[PDB]
Design a protein around this ligand. Structure first.
Ligand SMILES: O=C(O)c1cc([N+](=O)[O-])cc([N+](=O)[O-])c1O
Ligand SMILES: O=C(O)c1cc([N+](=O)[O-])cc([N+](=O)[O-])c1O
Ligand SMILES: O=C(O)c1cc([N+](=O)[O-])cc([N+](=O)[O-])c1O
Ligand SMILES: O=C(O)c1cc([N+](=O)[O-])cc([N+](=O)[O-])c1O
Lengths: 209, 207, 207, 209, 207, 209, 209, 207
């Protein structure tokens, strides 16, 4: 009954985009997964770009309920609007209704194991973009330790947190989910120059239940 | 006269929980909120002076505390445009308009102030909002080569500063009581193409 | 995904046996090899993700399995630039371009993985290549102070890490199926003035 | 007869704060100790943050004298002002006066044994915060040896000395107290990454009487 | 004209021992000190040129040496604003104003100069003060990327430099006689959030 | 025999001013030096204010010859007129004549070492005034490098070159003397705000002989 | 076929200039090489200054065909005009004619190896000019990476690409030739101040055949 | 066009054996040396490109080979400023100015190249001169994180690099003929507070 889990009422359409090349850089998507694009107003919760990227939403339509994984931006979607994948749309409605009424809310993701960090290509001690994947709840704040004090990083529309002059040593980092739960983790040192491509690092924590 | 008791009238409206002018979103759906008329909101010529204040509003049937999130444009002196839950606690909702006597009180905050950095903020142009403050914030200063540079507060409840630079910032806050606290804030982006982000402060105005 | 069939076309060239971008020399002259288009080779954004994979390629006239040793730069989606012997087994070389389907398969390896240490590698900066792997390697980790550091993979099919140290390395490899093995590797040179050298691993990705 | 032991004329208040969580990170404090918070002008003597942290001050009030241990900052305290603890206040004045006139000076601490080093959590060869504790006189200068030369470290308001790129080897340090008395010592190597908590190392020297 | 005999008048004040403009605290309560008129203090347009000088002042009753710790703002040419102990040494205190002849002389220093790094100093902006110097310092250079750089002296008796870096620096001092010495100085903070700290130098101006 | 070293015929007076507080801001002056004030027509050669500031003029009178350092403007001076120091006057003529006939020309100065830069109080990356001192020959053009190209700065009556928007980086500068000889130098970055006093920098070049 | 390889019909003269001091700063030039100056209209193709600088042009004349290297601007040249070196002119026409009809097109350069970077004197992290040399085809776009996105730099009449505030770290750069072919490369840090002369770096790519 | 015959004139001077701008001291007092005009010294816009070259110089009376130690700043095209012993060997000395024809030639070196590390060099900023080279050195590279980085040559005949680090360096040298040699060079000082020092190379440009 809080702000983060408030129930949205809107309409859904269906689309086959979002399994590949979504704006949120969450590939690879299981081709059998039920997914959705999210309208700007909710995706950018509180003005935080991509705040609900990778969230799981429970969606109720006229005739069923499904859980979907936010992988794309839905650029022209109205308030509370979803652009559902076809299997998710069919599980809650009739494809020949074109557009259906929906109600939805953020819910806990079916994650096992800890969060996963994706370091964007070209990241370095000078400029880096760090994405958090496999999180039980949407991630709204990313902090790291520098000279003994925490430094908050902004989230981008491509669902990474960007930081400048982060240095080239072991990063002590701190994450906050949309409920305000805080976890702390460590991450290996960034590349010294930005001549590298994507790589993934396992994290050592997971937001609680 | 910050502690002065206002006398006026209250209407109600279901706006303010989102998209209000003071950019205080997200508002707790449980919160009792209000829009504030221009004369008290822009106290002393300073835009959004009372933004994020807590007003103790006494009405016919009771007394409630509300959270200023919006401007009440056509509101008269001492006028409030309350949320439905706050209006119903202090008056009969049948009325549509009720007499009220209110005064600024201390927000029941836990923890320290929070800094909200507006999208597009940079070393060249930045807007910084202070939320979670015990009392309303009327002066925002940062330290440049030894002096405190005072920044104008805007109608959208951020302080705006130009050419603030890309280093660690030392800031000074003054609330409507004249209480002063000093804090640090991480460096702003070197270019202004980022969205909103939040950072915890390390101080709170005293009781 | 990564295991599904690919549909595309194959050209052919005599490059790749020597000096391919994936630094997999020495190549057996009897080998059937291919260069791989950028989209599939750099799967998931990971440079040279499919380096050293085996592709089962079906063509008009037959089926052949090939070893990814190079990048087909102008290559199109699902494009392969095949070696002649492999092109001629699955189609008419007279045609210059042929329709193909292909997918990743287990390599016909015997024995463990092999490590190749790039010239100039050292405790301060090192580049380490895994070859003779049953499936493609997408993640290379090493234990520092008791925790696993992930190293980025480069376009020249090595994993590059800084400040790795001059101690015995515990490492951990993840293939594209998500299978994990754990291995040891002798200490890196104290300074980066050494050439290429090779060391055998003690593990192979499960069948 | 010198600047360091000049006599301050001021006024005192009392407070029950400072036995725990004081700004100078001097816990644990004996609950029966006579302690004080110190106004910023004398606490930050010569502009050195926390210069008089851990000092002992002899305080003369209207009815007696008492020795207090400086554990916190009196943020709004006026010139020469002290925020005493209630036992120190009753030792020298009547609580019902609220505010009492005092005169105080720095005096020798009743220490037994050598100085003690406290290493802040998150210290490393890259960035480190080292506190000096159990010192006979206030410590105003912290130097360590690097490549043949001494290197001076600034003191902070949380009563630690802070250094960058200090290295992960055994440390030769040099301390100056507020009288100009000099001792030198060794400190075990700092952790190589900033992933450890607080710990305490015994020193081997003490400033003379 | 550095050893030139100045003829003026002296008054007395009890400021100077703390909070003087030249930031020379802490002052030995036993010291005889003076504030210096702007004409001789800001010699040649160089702010605080004679800061920390020792002036040998002759009066009607006797002669005393004073330590320049402050600016005598309304001071006249050759004017001094003495401390009560130095005025009493050389005049009848009941007289409020005495005629004086003085000149700069060598300070009775012991050991080498001392560097006082101002709060806020960093690789981006630093103020460095030289004290315990036999003669007044009028030029501060440091070596940057292989070249010497002259730093302006300020009214608060520090030399100021920007973008100086966060590494050991070679420096070069020139006293008012033209005597040059060279020294080293430790790394400035990488962030400008520290207080004052002191570092010993390794040279003194010759006799 | 060119335009810059053309022989001037005029009259000299003598004055005791210009050893201190001259308009060309060249203090300190050796009180033993032989100095002069220069009439506006030759001081502002080419219309370049202070073109001949700090020149050395060789001056022949009825009785001798002397070399003088131009330290001030002779405001009421007529064509080719000088207002000499008394020791320069007495070296070439009788002070009781009051006014003497002279013939003079610019000559190389007895510089030792390289040129010297004086930065005027209030200079900054936005507005700056830079004086060239200790030059073998008068300086008629001051250029600095911005964005790949030289930028000529006008000279003022107070013997500095003034530039707007010079920026706060290392300055590459180019100097021309009245003979057309060019030299190239470097100068440390200007203050970022005009809040500093005078200060001097050594140059690394001198005009050739 | 396309606009980049359209056949120009024009006239050619001969000049002995262009082997050194040409406006496009391509020295050193082999003295046996067949070179040309190129009229403004095709040299500044699409308005891009020096677009065809360092192009190779196949020139058919009345008498034969030759390939030429574009080293200079032909200021007064008409539409499709070339100012040929004497060996090139004599290879395709008779010199006594003084002016010959020519047809020509951009062709691939006899390039051995990868491209070559020439960094102009005075370049730095604040202002830098970078010339591409030894390119198989004319180079019409130059981009480098800053804060994670590409920044396009304008070409100059002196055949360098110029950028401001490029910084002093490793440069990831992207080159586009006149056919639209894109290669990616890296380049070492620019100097921190603009006090350096010309230096050269080899690239690691070439435009495809 | 670099080894072409230059036709110009020579003067003579007693400078260049000490304090020459190419920092080639100590110069053998028996050596025949020359200052070189800016046009040929700075070939291709590379500062000091021909520093330490040997020029065979033909004049009216004979021939001599000279060692380029200095910049001849006023020198005209192909201009040389010879030392007295070199001028006297090829000209009448009373002439003051003589016609000359000259070309770069191989230096009669013995042994490998020598490296000279400028005072103040460090891992942060370093200046490295190459001495004892058969032909002029026009490009200097060092390996950093696996790749070559080119350093600009300066008017004082050193290559300057920033952030080169404090570890063993792999370096690559290119002479003006296009010949390439590879070498190693001991770690630079971790702080720039040292004087000049020399280290032997292990390679020499081919004949
Ligand atoms: O600190 C945060 O991460 C934070 C995040 C949001 N948010 O994600 O909407 C809002 C507030 N806030 O204070 O209203 C925050 O403090
Ligand atoms: O084990 C080796 O000694 C070894 C040697 C070479 N080699 O000498 O080229 C190549 C490989 N390899 O696995 O390609 C090796 O394993
Ligand atoms: O060396 C120091 O630690 C030091 C400390 C102070 N201080 O704590 O006021 C003053 C000076 N000083 O030179 O005036 C110092 O040299
Ligand atoms: O290697 C050396 O120790 C050495 C020393 C000097 N030096 O002591 O003047 C000069 C050269 N040199 O090559 O000109 C050297 O090689």
């Amino acid at each position: 009954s809080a702000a983060w889990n408030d129930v949205c009422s809107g309409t859904a359409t269906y689309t086959s985009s979002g399994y590949s090349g979504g704006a949120l850089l969450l590939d690879p998507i299981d081709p059998n997964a039920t997914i959705t694009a999210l309208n700007p107003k909710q995706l950018n919760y509180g003005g935080i770009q991509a705040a609900l990227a990778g969230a799981y939403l429970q969606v109720q339509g006229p005739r069923g309920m499904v859980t979907v994984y936010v992988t794309d931006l839905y650029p022209e979607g109205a308030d509370c609007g979803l652009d559902l994948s076809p299997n998710a749309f069919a599980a809650i409605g009739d494809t020949s209704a074109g557009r259906i009424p929906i109600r939805w809310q953020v819910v806990a993701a079916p994650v096992t194991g800890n969060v996963v960090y994706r370091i964007k290509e070209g990241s370095s001690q000078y400029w880096a973009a760090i994405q958090v994947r496999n999180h039980r709840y949407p991630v709204v704040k990313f902090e790291y330790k520098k000279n003994g004090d925490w430094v908050s990083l902004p989230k981008t529309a491509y669902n990474h947190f960007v930081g400048e002059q982060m240095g080239a040593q072991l990063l002590e980092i701190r994450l906050t989910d949309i409920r305000g739960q805080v976890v702390t983790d460590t991450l290996g040192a960034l590349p010294s120059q930005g001549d590298k491509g994507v790589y993934f690092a396992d994290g050592h924590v997971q937001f609680p239940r």
